Amino acid sequence: NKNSSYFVEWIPNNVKTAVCDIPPRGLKMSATFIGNSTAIQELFKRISEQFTAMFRRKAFLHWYTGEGMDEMEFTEAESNMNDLVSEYQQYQDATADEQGEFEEEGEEDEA
Amino acid sequence: SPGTPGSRSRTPSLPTPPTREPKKVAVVRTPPKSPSSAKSRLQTAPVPM
């Protein structure tokens, strides 16, 4: 109710609870949280950008290939980290909708 | 190296025909009716004069 926009709307109801009867050591009660927000897209968008800030200039790269790598291995993995940002882009700001797109009944009035 | 490899499908597209609507919604006709029959009935004399 207080935060309705900060749920994804195609996941109507979003919470999974567990209750153990026992606290940890300390105070009478505590609660652990685990979140899955598209917000973390701002973790990957940073590292891909700082990868790009090393990769063209090739700085340090000789030590990675040196132990064993080809340049293709970096190039599929940064591309991976771009594909994952596009998964969050697919799954951010999308709506509550039906199985597939569909066309409505129009205006046809000509007579 | 090119970062999008050749190992990957590159199937080129086709002439797909035009799109028909999802639903017809053609007009309906009302079904027919005749009136309800009485079930409990009027009866004649079983006995004469």
Curated annotation (Swiss-Prot), chain A:
Keyword annotations of the record: Acetylation, Cytoplasm, Cytoskeleton, GTP-binding, Isopeptide bond, Magnesium, Metal-binding, Methylation, Microtubule, Nucleotide-binding, Phosphoprotein, Ubl conjugation
Positions where 5-glutamyl polyglutamate occurs in the chain: E104
Q: Name one GO biological process term.
A: microtubule cytoskeleton organization
Query: Which molecular-function annotation in GO is an example for this chain?
Result: GTP binding
- Protein location: Cytoplasm, Cytoskeleton
Q: Where is this region: Disordered?
A: 90-111
What spans are recorded as compositionally biased (Acidic residues)? 95-111
Gene Ontology cellular component terms for the protein in this record: cytoplasm; microtubule
Mod. after translation: Some glutamate residues at the C-terminus are polyglycylated, resulting in polyglycine chains on the gamma-carboxyl group. Glycylation is mainly limited to tubulin incorporated into axonemes (cilia and flagella) whereas glutamylation is prevalent in neuronal cells, centrioles, axonemes, and the mitotic spindle. Both modifications can coexist on the same protein on adjacent residues, and lowering polyglycylation levels increases polyglutamylation, and reciprocally. Cilia and flagella glycylation is required for their stability and maintenance. Flagella glycylation controls sperm motility. Some glutamate residues at the C-terminus are polyglutamylated, resulting in polyglutamate chains on the gamma-carboxyl group. Polyglutamylation plays a key role in microtubule severing by spastin (SPAST). SPAST preferentially recognizes and acts on microtubules decorated with short polyglutamate tails: severing activity by SPAST increases as the number of glutamates per tubulin rises from one to eight, but decreases beyond this glutamylation threshold.
Main location class: cytoplasm
**What family is it from?**
Belongs to the tubulin family.
Q: Could you share any additional remarks the record makes about this protein? A: The highly acidic C-terminal region may bind cations such as calcium.
Quote the record's domain comment: The MREI motif is common among all beta-tubulin isoforms and may be critical for tubulin autoregulation.
Q: How does it assemble?
A: Dimer of alpha and beta chains. A typical microtubule is a hollow water-filled tube with an outer diameter of 25 nm and an inner diameter of 15 nM. Alpha-beta heterodimers associate head-to-tail to form protofilaments running lengthwise along the microtubule wall with the beta-tubulin subunit facing the microtubule plus end conferring a structural polarity. Microtubules usually have 13 protofilaments but different protofilament numbers can be found in some organisms and specialized cells. Interacts with NCKAP5L.
- What is this protein's function per UniProt? Tubulin is the major constituent of microtubules, a cylinder consisting of laterally associated linear protofilaments composed of alpha- and beta-tubulin heterodimers. Microtubules grow by the addition of GTP-tubulin dimers to the microtubule end, where a stabilizing cap forms. Below the cap, tubulin dimers are in GDP-bound state, owing to GTPase activity of alpha-tubulin.
Name this polypeptide is given: Tubulin beta chain
UniProtKB/Swiss-Prot annotation, chain B:
Which positions carry N6-acetyllysine? K24
* Native organism taxonomy: Eukaryota, Metazoa, Chordata, Craniata, Vertebrata
Q: Per its record, how is this protein called by name?
A: Microtubule-associated protein tau
User: Which stretch of the intact protein is present?
Assistant: 519 to 567 of 758
Q: Which residues carry this modification: Phosphothreonine?
A: T4, T11, T16, T30
Signal peptide coordinates: none
> PTMs?
Phosphorylation at serine and threonine residues in S-P or T-P motifs by proline-directed protein kinases (PDPK1, CDK1, CDK5, GSK3, MAPK) (only 2-3 sites per protein in interphase, seven-fold increase in mitosis, and in the form associated with paired helical filaments (PHF-tau)), and at serine residues in K-X-G-S motifs by MAP/microtubule affinity-regulating kinase (MARK1, MARK2, MARK3 or MARK4), causing detachment from microtubules, and their disassembly. Phosphorylation decreases with age. Polyubiquitinated. Requires functional TRAF6 and may provoke SQSTM1-dependent degradation by the proteasome. PHF-tau can be modified by three different forms of polyubiquitination. 'Lys-48'-linked polyubiquitination is the major form, 'Lys-6'-linked and 'Lys-11'-linked polyubiquitination also occur.
Localization recorded for this chain is: Cytoplasm, Cytosol; Cell membrane; Cytoplasm, Cytoskeleton; Cell projection, Axon
Q: Please give the subunit comment from the record.
A: Interacts with MARK1, MARK2, MARK3 and MARK4. Interacts with PSMC2 through SQSTM1. Interacts with SQSTM1 when polyubiquitinated. Interacts with FKBP4. Binds to CSNK1D. Interacts with SGK1. Interacts with PIN1. Interacts with LRRK2. Interacts with LRP1, leading to endocytosis; this interaction is reduced in the presence of LRPAP1/RAP.
The record's comment about this protein's domains reads:
The tau/MAP repeat binds to tubulin. Type I isoforms contain 3 repeats while type II isoforms contain 4 repeats.
Q: Where is this site: Not glycated?
A: K23, K39
Q: In which tissues is it expressed?
A: Expressed in neurons. Isoform PNS-tau is expressed in the peripheral nervous system while the others are expressed in the central nervous system.
- Sites carrying a glycan are S7, K24, K33, S37
Q: What is the effect of changing S34A?
A: 70% decrease in microtubule-binding after in vitro phosphorylation of mutant protein
Instruction: Please give the function described in this protein's UniProt entry.
Output: Promotes microtubule assembly and stability, and might be involved in the establishment and maintenance of neuronal polarity. The C-terminus binds axonal microtubules while the N-terminus binds neural plasma membrane components, suggesting that tau functions as a linker protein between both. Axonal polarity is predetermined by TAU/MAPT localization (in the neuronal cell) in the domain of the cell body defined by the centrosome. The short isoforms allow plasticity of the cytoskeleton whereas the longer isoforms may preferentially play a role in its stabilization.
**Source domain of life:** Eukaryota
